Point group: C2
Chain length 284, copies 2
Amino acid sequence: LELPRPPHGELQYLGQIQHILRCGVRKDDRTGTGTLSVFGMQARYSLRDEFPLLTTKRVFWKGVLEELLWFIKGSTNAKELSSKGVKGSRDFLDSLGFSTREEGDLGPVYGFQWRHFGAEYRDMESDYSGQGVDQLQRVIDTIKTNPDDRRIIMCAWNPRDLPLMALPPCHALCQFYVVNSELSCQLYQRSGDMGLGVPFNIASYALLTYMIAHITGLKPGDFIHTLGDAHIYLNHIEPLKIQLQREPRPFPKLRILRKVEKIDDFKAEDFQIEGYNPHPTIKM
Amino acid sequence: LELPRPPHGELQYLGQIQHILRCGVRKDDRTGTGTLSVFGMQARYSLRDEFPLLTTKRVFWKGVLEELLWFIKGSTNAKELSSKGVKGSRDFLDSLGFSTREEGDLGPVYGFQWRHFGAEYRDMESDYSGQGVDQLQRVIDTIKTNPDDRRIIMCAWNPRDLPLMALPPCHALCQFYVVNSELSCQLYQRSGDMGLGVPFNIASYALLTYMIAHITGLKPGDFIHTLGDAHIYLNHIEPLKIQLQREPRPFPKLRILRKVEKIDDFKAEDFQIEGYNPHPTIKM
């Protein structure tokens, strides 16, 4: 000053979709584009011996993993992520100069807030080591020093908000929780695009929880996803109605293939999804 | 850089208590005092033509109202609230000087963060007008200028955390939401003392929502209460087991007795609880 920014567990997601379709009210987003919206939702996904990669459509796991690793790096260079695209809308692009945004320099945004919160920015690929609050390392350090702590929290901001106002609110708050050698994670997002963003975000924060648990010597516990404005875009209603007709398949497993000691040391090759049997891809 | 820091709706609260009693795990708090704990809970209370003042014990409404008005004032003078006591623990008292804490000067704490976030402190009863971010007025202003906004958020900090670290995390995040001329509120707390704090906090934020809705010309909608570490103190188990045996009575109504234009103008006399028929008080 996304991402970001016993019954099968996926039945929660499908029930939430069905609830929004039935009971959601018309509400416009910042661009005047229509959604059906309910305020206040929550779902709990076990991370114990399974990984909540949704099965009622094929979720883009490769991009989940690559984007998370980019965020962990604290990168503000869009070209270091050139195997897909991040965050509608890009109105925050209007705040940037001519030369700097042509290079793929995004200014102090995204993972820069996870690794270097509040540091004075200069350019991408300058040395920010020891500058700002490292929220991610702080979470890991707190897990190791005081696992009972109720303040193990990291936030992410939509880059569009940073030059808008003083003390801008975050988009997502992630709280961790440790008991009996298990690490759980609760993600609160002020808004969630249920068709496109939500399945991606479940995978992203479940992956983060696996990574943090690995390096802290803990077992993954639960992932709890909590929303403010939970919404379905109007143009997604028909595909979602079809996805609701599909029966979830057992969740896959996530294996970490190497002993990794530091969060910065994970590479995409360290991870293997096993037994993933999704229904076909849905374009939204 | 608490507070803070169709089936009857109260059946959610009682079910959450029962769940923690049955399935919660032993976890210590910062003082090494034992709790039973579950991570991730949510409950929804309708504010439409009723007010969620719990009925399975008498909730201290007078103190809910007086403490909220004190917070809205941005007061850091403990004596301006001398009809009860705020926030265990008071370890943050160790950060204060001799003369200043004898006067009831608490430093930049509590409502000071709601009305004057980030302003340089001097002493209580000095003029902070126009200093820092006024989070509460900002919420009200955003409701009036852009009711679709997904960023209508105000945070509260435990005063103990403010001198502990850079960028300390909040204790509670309150998000508002407007659709169809109704104002809803979601309160996320990183931890909730289910026996003592939680019923008080439901009343406090439901009251806040009534007040904000009054001055913005909207009808109260839902109050959604979301927790991180939801816990029951061990010494409260027996009284809670008894409270679970009680059948909720219909919620009371809350009447605002005057047209009030500005948030700072509300007085305790403007409010009237009607039809409140609680079970008897439980000391915890």
